[PDB]
Ligand binder design. Structure first.
Ligand SMILES: [Ca+2]
Ligand SMILES: [Ca+2]
Ligand SMILES: [Ca+2]
Lengths: 513, 512, 511, 509
């Protein structure tokens, strides 16, 4: 029975989850997300499943780990037969739509979404394929580099602001269109994903929002740059992949990058308020669950690192909030995962556990919201640029454990060491630290065959090097999504009942005052 | 110096009808003429007796268990290299006119250009369900209505399709010939993939009239009663709804007659393509390959269509002619799996570049007289199976295994009609040793329990996704050819001083 | 021709729970049935979010600044006319069963008869002091111990009280029906004033079990940290000793579950009253009014109880059914101040008789489709205030002023949970013009310096007087219902022949 | 070590009869012996010439305009502090035997215990109406029938009342004496408030016979005819319905004779209280205050009763005797407004605890030789007024104002009988300057138009309320004294061997 709630998923890109200690941090100018946070169940220790765009987003859609989706990097094909939350909801009777980006690679640019309002900002082809056969070599034309840090600043239009302006406009327009069915008893409930590209770099913001942070006290990272020689091996691979030696990052560069990033959160907050105002005025808010989420974090100069690709807090933590009918507001400290979003959504929509159990590696967060302890650990994977073999991580209780066949292990006690400055795998405090390291090693072997993981990643890369080079010979066939809204069926046309058209398009109906 | 490549593919052509080129009784002058100048692989097999699995496997030179295209509704991943990718990577312009039954949103799988849509769906509709053994889906399963409905018409769904496939292929050849005189041209590879002689068995009168005196309108083995059929054959008859059709001897003769007529319909189209190649002066530089995806039992044993490993269903013709190809008849068993490595080899691509991507072998050494020893493998995991089946063809033997069924072993030299199952009725110790050798070879190649679990998981995925995709507004995956009218023929942004010259070929007396 | 009037009043009922009658999720069949035949005032506000100021203002139809009942220990002058006086003057028998939190020696204030004592004290104990801003008083201030102590019990102080209130109210209706056949009978007005769902949040198991599957056991806005609270909310949070209590999520759920249970408890008593009216054949001649004195935040924003102008605290239900009342839902804001002139109007009293004595307006024109334009006014001047607060509700707007605090402006159609203070954070030019207009409206209704000086003098008087009165033998003011035993039932001075007939009703019937 | 306080209050006693204690011609041996040991305030005034306004003002030490008790039916709010409150706060036991004419449901106003009900109503019955000037309410207004009905009787409504008032007040002193030998005993303050010599002018024959040859049975200023009266006096004459009585010279003499007799009746009762204090050994530790609510014209000028600011109506006696009180006569005008701050001063209460609550001053400084300069203010806003009246008494002067009447100014030294109105015809520039001085002082003290509006609002409220309150079953506010018999005398839950000793006092051989 369709007493089912509507679902508005607001997503943003590259949002460091530590900036949401309990809703947005006090220092951020974000009135609309703070007001949303007060009505929300808030998951303080929520993690991405993979600190990179396409792997995190394919994993997010399916509620499955990259090792199961096979979307290892930003150029890996996402099979159209993999069930996503759009399939699960659509099968249960929802209209499903996406406005904005999801970095799906391959010719399927919908993956269950019934309608998609924008193209993607990023490529949909196999261009950005890493190569495990050439460790230490970087592809300068698509790899991250620190020019974002040295080029931060102020502008009134950017590639990303043109995208997000449009993402927001078409999202609010779709809500307005949906509200015209509000009185139809046979209406399908709806689930709209609004997926913004900010605050992803470039770190460039409109002057109105940049000015908000003139007096900002958080423009210096809380852990300074660690010299290359003192970095752990993965961090060294990242600084090399970012071409760090060819940039002189000053203190001012760091301050301007962080200022523009905070400004772009404030830019998004204005868009969040627009969406909620639309919901309020179309009389749809009380029946609508609102979920706020992100794909991965951004180190923001902490430890001298920028962007993502690692499991340190700033990169792996992303915010997660849920508000609406039946959701108790509150703060939750138990680690949760992006992998839990899809089963959480299925549960909120009234779908049985048995229908989604075969298709997800996460757990519904609804029992948490209703006072049931969650015990499952949080699992993460990374297998893209700046790795030479896959890395996996486990987050459970107060611990984070990181393994890569090529590197010394890492173990962090986040209650005693929230900034992850003391590796206990190498400097154990006592026998408990050693017993803990042993138990995580066994957990690691219970979840991953790291040799098979490496081999599968190498085969996936190898396929695409053959295929992508072929596809770039001769005439190119693009896979980018092209939204179509048929002009011949919109607004007023002479095959329609014109004395009924205006009433159909009007909502609310029959009112004055 | 790289040759052009024309691939002529037909659908559902029983390979037993090409004993040495087309059988004598077929009216097929153009294919018999092409055969005389071809290397002919008399004992060539499909890799899977079903359209999409055979075609995905044909395109990749990989077995269905590797492509994952188990049935007619299984997604074919776009990251899987095909002979299109391999040729295109080597510098070929590649194009497809006709069908390939690709399932999923990629309708090119490496082809640079595709001139027609597919005749069949590109979505997950036709998914079998191993969880419901014994039922059928009436709205897409085969049924014997094609046998009782055979006859004569001047247009059909398939004749509209194939008429269009032919026109656009000859037009593309004409278009390509305009680049003949430019030394920096790319060589081209054009696949022309017709839907005939696949059923419905309905032919144009012109071609139905050619077989009025035909002496092959009776199958060579008669209908085997259901109680005497091996279990898989029983499953095929149930899936075809055999009990609700009263197939008469006249139904059988008419179906076979129209089927032979449609081969002659195709033969005319082969002559058109050869004629285009001749008059455009590209024939001498063009390799010509003739192939099919699977066969058709055509009433033999009482069976119709495909879905099994018997000769009529699993045999398909294969020939290659052109520059550097010595003609002759080859008898060692070969596979559609070999087509992709054979193409790459003919195009000068190194064996090492294709080795990691193909389970077949190049046939070019065979064309040049080299003995072959590699066996021929086949798989089936779609409708009328309740669990996967596999077959091995080696020397004179064929072995067929399904976990649920008695094994089958045939000696095709002593028993070309596979009337004696030597697994059940061995002639002596050598047949017993042979069975054991094939058992061991099967176990080293397939884990049939892992195979069955992979097929089940693939079916279950699609049951969830397809039901969702059929809710709300449908988003189609069918390929839409686009030829930009604003850039064709005469337009006022173009150099009209040079347009006519560039579109004229050959450029003889009067041309610039 | 004058109709009977039954006023059903409950205590601390959050008006947001009555969007259109009781909300669907409440188990309240009797109040849902009453609502369906009622004029229902969706946006009805208390005039002061505290028990005694709200109740004295309700009785008089006058704001606290006029009644002088500023807090829960402020004397209510017996010379102030109430709806009981107005009706009694027009020929009504008037009676109260239940509480009214009247402070001072007059415990009737016009009621001709009162069937129970009060549940609360009648003296000057609970007196605030503006000369000591920042202190709290633990032996009478609200504290969060009600939240941590919520649960289930088969008797409580409040359930003993309300069981008696209900029994005597139904008994009185039965007594009154014996005069139905007399043409010269006075019409009656009976006020039944229950103490639930006021805390303690403790309910009978039977009603507790109704809400096991409830989806509203948590509030729509969570606890806002002290540092982010507006200053009045901060004063309140200190006032309930919020830091001395560890309020778990389960405490929140148990508290709201028992509160909902006690509404269902009340719903059963509403049905008994209606059933008595039905069987005595007085239903068709009786106006029924359902009301409350103030709301309860119930954990929203982290706040419990009242003392503020936020919706959960200031909104209270108001419903009217009966002869001459067209049913319907009304969204224009209305006020408890309006009940007294509404009642007098329904009783045939002229507007001129009541105009000099009321700050509200009759709602009868609303019921009959006539637009109401007067704003809704509210005041607070008790504990957790350091100076009086006033509020104005008009159109979609709510404006709150206190001379010690930043102003608050809410657009309730855009922001029904009041999460954006538009005085600090206007959305545009119209928010600003609207702020200026409310400031002008405020200066037109209130002299805030005179308000504060009158509150301070009243507090100081009582501090001198109460100290004295708690020395020596105490003289209590609690109402004691009259004793009539020698004139009740069968006594040998009466006529034992007509006695049974007089006490019987209906009379001379069979079937 | 705080003293006991006995307040003896009488009703309607003309203060001019106490020129230095009681006048010689009165038979009042006990009040004269008391006067001799008393500080005596010869020129003491009521704050309002009417029962309930005077008594509410007496208790609060606040003017009627501040108490809001404007007339004999105006509610007295229980939140207004009274001298009972102040003394109770300071550790005193406080009690009242007799009348106080408190209107409203509070019949204690801080008294811890009250031994009798009131002789007068406690409800809003006697409410005037400024909207109907010139009319009168015959069922409770004063009328001259008291003057024509004067005589002799052995029991009256008032003698029954005052006999019981006296008996319960002496019993209470006995009960209090049992606590004498207890160190932790609270000090006590007992107010004994008699209804005499208020009219009816009817006395017991014993006391009536004491004035056979009395030489003061003729008023010192005869009747003034209506058309020669000041307009307020005219309003009073109509309110008493004067033209419906033939008041003879005999009626005047009879009324004044019965009035003087009832002073003697009261004097006997004062002797009883004093004797009870003496024999219980509480006397030396007890302050004794003698006072009255308002006066009585007693025929002077042809007027009777009160309601005006003339000397006979506005003067009331005031005396204080006891520990720490130097005897002597004081001539500076004082006011009933001063009793409450005087009591609080005598009880050791600091001046700051009481100053925000009183419009009067402590008289203890005068008793001890400190000159007092504050003026004496009075107000009247009840029957026979159509708008409020105020008066200022300072030095030798009395100024009387009502917006609707000509002003009155009197020099009481040159003109003790108030026969020459210096506002209408002054003696010279000094008189004129004086009138101007008072006009300005009055304007600084009262807005008379705000006064009139508050009186009207109070009347209007009560007209709505009192009508309702008199429909249906009536709920009375009259005080019912408490007396648990189950806890009195000898009961079988107490220690009987111990009961007799604790109820016995003094406790010697
Ligand atoms: Ca991204
Ligand atoms: Ca096919
Ligand atoms: Ca209350």
């Amino acid at each position: 029975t369709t007493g089912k709630p509507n679902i508005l998923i607001i997503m943003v890109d590259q949002l460091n989850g530590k900036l949401f200690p309990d809703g947005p941090a006090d220092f951020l100018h974000a009135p609309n997300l703070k007001a949303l946070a007060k009505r929300s169940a808030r998951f303080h220790n929520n993690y991405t499943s993979s600190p990179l765009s396409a792997p995190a987003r394919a994993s997010f859609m399916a509620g499955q780990l990259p090792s199961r989706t096979r979307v290892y990097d930003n150029a890996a094909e996402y099979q159209s037969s993999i069930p996503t939350y759009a399939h699960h909801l659509r099968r249960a009777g929802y209209y499903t739509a996406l406005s904005g980006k999801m970095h799906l690679v391959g010719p399927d640019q919908l993956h269950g979404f019934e309608e998609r309002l924008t193209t993607d900002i990023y490529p949909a082809d196999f261009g950005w394929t890493p190569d495990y056969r050439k460790p230490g070599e970087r592809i300068d034309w698509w790899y991250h580099n620190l020019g974002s840090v040295t080029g931060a600043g102020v502008a009134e239009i950017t590639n990303q602001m043109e995208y997000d302006d449009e993402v927001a406009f078409l999202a609010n327009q779709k809500l307005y269109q949906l509200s015209r069915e509000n009185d139809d008893e046979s209406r399908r409930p709806w689930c709209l994903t609004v997926s913004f590209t900010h605050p992803h770099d470039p770190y460039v913001a409109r002057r109105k929002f940049w000015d908000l942070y003139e007096d900002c006290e958080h423009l210096t990272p809380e852990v300074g740059a660690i010299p290359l020689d003192e970095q752990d091996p993965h961090s060294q691979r990242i600084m090399l992949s970012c071409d760090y030696q060819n940039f002189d990052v000053t203190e001012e560069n760091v301050r301007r990058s962080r200022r523009a990033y905070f400004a772009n959160i404030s830019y998004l907050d204005e868009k969040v308020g627009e969406l909620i105002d639309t919901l309020t005025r179309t009389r749809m808010l009380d029946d609508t669950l609102i979920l706020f989420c992100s794909d991965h974090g951004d180190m923001l100069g902490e430890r001298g690192l920028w962007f993502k690709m690692n499991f340190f807090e700033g990169s792996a933590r992303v915010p997660l909030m849920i508000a609406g009918p039946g959701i108790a507001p509150g703060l939750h400290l138990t680690p949760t995962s992006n992998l839990d979003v899809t089963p959480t959504l299925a549960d909120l929509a009234g779908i049985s556990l048995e229908e989604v159990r075969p298709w997800t590696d996460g757990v519904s967060l609804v029992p948490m919201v209703n006072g049931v302890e969650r015990t499952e650990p949080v699992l993460m994977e990374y297998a893209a640029e700046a790795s030479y073999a896959p890395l996996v991580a486990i987050r459970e209780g107060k611990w984070k454990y990181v393994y890569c066949a090529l590197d010394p292990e890492q173990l962090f006690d986040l209650e005693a060491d929230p900034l992850e400055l003391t590796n206990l795998a190498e400097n154990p405090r006592g026998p408990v630290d050693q017993a803990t390291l042993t138990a995580f090693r066994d957990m690691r072997a219970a979840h991953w065959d790291m040799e098979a993981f490496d081999a599968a990643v190498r085969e996936s890369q190898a396929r695409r090097w053959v295929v992508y080079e072929a596809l770039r010979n001769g005439a190119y066939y693009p896979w980018d999504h092209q939204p179509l809204q048929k002009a011949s069926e919109r607004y007023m046309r002479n095959h329609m009942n014109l004395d009924t058209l205006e009433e159909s398009k009007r909502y609310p109906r029959g009112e004055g005052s």
